[PDB]
Design a protein around this nucleic acid. Structure first.
Length: 54
RNA sequence: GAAACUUAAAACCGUGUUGCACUGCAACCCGGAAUUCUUGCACGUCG
């Protein structure tokens, strides 16, 4: 849902620890959202189009 | 006995349908098998 998508700014810190605000504002997400994907592996033998060690 | 053509003239001709009825017809799937698939971060760089 679009209720949680805040706008950030690209800040480039250096070895002295002094960031600068570039003009690169972009609609990002926010820390706290959970994204859940599904991964499916295929246990057919190798050279049949499978990967038992994946 | 020696001497005088049973000769002359005359179409085997005229008329007449190899014609009348009859389906190259009945029955028959251009049908059965086959993934527009395989790999690929809308990303990198900030006096």
């Amino acid at each position: 849902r679009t209720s949680d998508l805040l706008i950030c700014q690209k800040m480039d810190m250096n070895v002295h620890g002094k960031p600068d605000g570039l003009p690169l504002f972009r609609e990002c997400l926010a820390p706290g959202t959970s994204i859940s994907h599904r991964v499916v592996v295929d246990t057919s033998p190798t050279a049949r189009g499978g990967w038992r060690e994946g």
